[PDB]
């Protein structure tokens, strides 16, 4: 079964680490880096890793039951899976699938629709934020702590968190949270990735997301877009080597813009060619060319 990439253009793709369209391709203009995101992790032959799940509108969302305590009001959410199934902390995952995979304050909206009590069917929704550095950000153990200026939430009812953007200018998108809290190490992580040779850089799909105040840039970079995650998962094409050579092509003219290594683990490297911003034709997309190996030498893009 031949390996293929979606034929969606850049403006037609979704970030796999935040619910947002892709705004541009991006390489670090300073140096090469090492990164270990847990959303947006899929091997070329279709193996999901980390906390990666398939629904683009559920990335960095949470679902569960509000548990009352004992100006910002604390909201302890006892989690279930995003698809509604019970959350099992013994699963071999770093945290509930879809959990926020970086240190920062994410603002969003928490909503409820009552299923028990004297007001079944009554609803409410308000802005909240989740600080993933909080010691009670413990999505591996099955709970997260939100905060809201509103006290208008009902104890014991189904509660959903939908992320919107930066709730403070404090994002560190490549620093993993402590998914089990302060006294347990992360486990079952998708591996760290980095260029294997000097002169290469990871190529990211970058989104710029909203911010609720301050001057935060809102950058969230993913290794492959969510549509690629969905595509590889369904195709499950055998990988014929550790490295697929791909090219950004203009499908209307056949012109090759630049080449890149698509690693079997599910990320892209390019040859460094300076701090120049990346400009591609808006009708262009990546196309699989051939299976190669690590000794392939990329031409500067």
Ligand X SMILES: C[C@@H]1O[C@@H](O[C@@H]2[C@@H](O)[C@@H](O)[C@@H](CO)O[C@H]2O)[C@@H](O)[C@H](O)[C@@H]1O
Token readout for 297 is 């030498």
Minimum Å distance from CB 148 to ligand X?
12
* 206 within 8 A of 258, measured Cβ to Cβ: no
Contact code string over 6-35 relative to a copy of itself, x by CB under 8 A: xxx--xxxx----xxx-x------------
Asked if 75 and 67 touch (Cβ cutoff 8 Å), the reply is no
- CB of 72 vs ligand X, minimal distance in Å: 13
Interface residue with ligand X among 7, 122, 192, 290 (CB under 6 A) is 122
> What number of other Cβ atoms are within 10 A of residue 245's Cβ?
17
166's contact among a copy of itself, ligand X, none, with CB below 5 to 8 A by partner kind, is a copy of itself
Per DSSP (E only), the strands in 52-148 are: 62-67, 73-80, 105-113, 123-131, 143-148
Spatial contact of 137 and 181, defined as CB atoms under 8 Å apart: yes
Q: Select 162 or 186, whichever has its Cβ closest to a copy of itself.
A: 162
Q: Is 230 in the site for a copy of itself (CB under 8 A)?
A: yes
When asked if residue 210 is in the footprint of a copy of itself (CB under 8 A), the reply is yes
Residue at token pair 């950000």: 137
Compute CA 203 distance to the chain's CA centroid, rounded to the nearest angstrom: 15
Mark 62-91 with x for binding to a copy of itself (rule: CB under 8 A) and - for no binding: --------------------xxxx------
- Does position 76 interact with ligand X (CB under 6 A)? The reply is no
Contact pick of 124, 219, 247, 264 for a copy of itself (by CB under 8 A): 124
Closest CA to 80 of 90, 92, 89, 68: 89
- The span of 1-9, 122-130, 189-197, 256-264 binding ligand X (CB under 6 A) equals 122-130
Verify binding: residue 214, ligand X, rule CB under 6 A: yes
Among 140, 160, 201, 206, binds a copy of itself (CB under 8 A): 160
d(CA 95, CA 178): 10
Q: Going by C-beta distance under 8 Å and a sequence separation of 6 or more, which residues neighbour residue 248?
A: 256, 257, 258, 259, 260, 280, 284, 285, 286, 287
Closest distance between a copy of itself and the C-beta of residue 267, in Å? 22
Closest CA relative to residue 64, chosen from 51, 80, 53 = 80
Three-state SS for 269? strand
The bridge status of strand 219-222 relative to strand 285-292 is unpaired
Per the structure block, which two tokens stand in for 87? 């959350």
Pick the piece of the chain touching ligand X (CB under 6 A) from 91-99, 103-111, 119-127, 242-250.
119-127
Is the Cβ–Cβ distance between 222 and 40 less than 8 Å? yes
Beta partners for residue 158, in sequence order? 65
Residue of the chain from 27, 211, 239, 269 that contacts a copy of itself (CB under 8 A): 211
Q: What is the largest CA-CA distance in the chain?
A: 67
**Smallest gap from residue 124 Cβ to ligand X (A):** 4
Q: Is 72 in the site for ligand X (CB under 6 A)?
A: no
* 239 to 278: interface string for a copy of itself, x by CB under 8 A: ----------------------------------------
124 binds ligand X (CB under 6 A): yes
Q: Binding to ligand X by residue 290, rule CB under 6 A?
A: no
Q: Name the residues that contact a copy of itself, by CB under 8 A.
A: 6-8, 11-14, 19-21, 23, 53-58, 82-85, 107, 109, 111, 113, 121-127, 160, 162, 164-166, 208, 210-218, 227, 230, 234, 282
Q: Name the residues that contact ligand X, by CB under 6 A.
A: 122-124, 152, 213-214
């Amino acid at each position: 079964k031949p390996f293929t990439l979606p034929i969606l253009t850049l403006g037609e793709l979704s970030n796999s680490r935040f619910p947002a369209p892709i705004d541009m391709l991006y390489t670090d203009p300073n140096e090469a880096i090492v990164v270990q995101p847990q959303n947006g992790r899929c091997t070329l032959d279709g193996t999901l890793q980390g906390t990666t799940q398939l629904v683009p509108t559920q990335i960095c969302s949470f679902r569960g039951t509000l548990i009352s305590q004992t100006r910002n009001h604390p909201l302890h959410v006892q989690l279930k899976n995003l698809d509604g199934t019970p959350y099992d902390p013994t699963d071999e995952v770093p945290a509930v699938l879809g959990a926020i995979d970086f240190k920062g304050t994410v603002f969003g909206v928490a909503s409820q629709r009552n299923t028990t009590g004297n007001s079944i069917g009554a609803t409410r929704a308000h802005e909240v934020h989740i600080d993933t550095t909080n010691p009670r950000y413990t999505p591996k153990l099955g709970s997260v702590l939100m905060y809201s200026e509103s006290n208008d939430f009902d104890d014991g009812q189904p509660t959903r968190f939908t992320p919107i953007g930066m709730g403070a200018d404090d994002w560190h998108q490549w620093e993993l949270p402590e998914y089990s809290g302060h006294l347990t190490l992360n486990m079952n992580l998708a591996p760290a990735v980095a260029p294997a040779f000097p002169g290469e850089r990871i190529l990211f799909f970058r989104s710029v997301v909203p911010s609720a105040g301050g001057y935060g840039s809102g950058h969230i970079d993913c290794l492959i877009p969510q549509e690629w995650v969905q595509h590889f998962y369904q195709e499950a094409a055998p990988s014929q080597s550790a490295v697929a050579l791909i090219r950004y092509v203009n499908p209307d003219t056949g012109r090759n813009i630049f080449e890149a290594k698509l690693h079997r683990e599910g990320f892209i490297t390019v040859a460094n060619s300076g701090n120049n911003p990346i400009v591609v034709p808006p009708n262009g997309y990546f196309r699989f060319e051939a299976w190669v190996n690590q000794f392939y030498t990329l031409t500067p893009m």
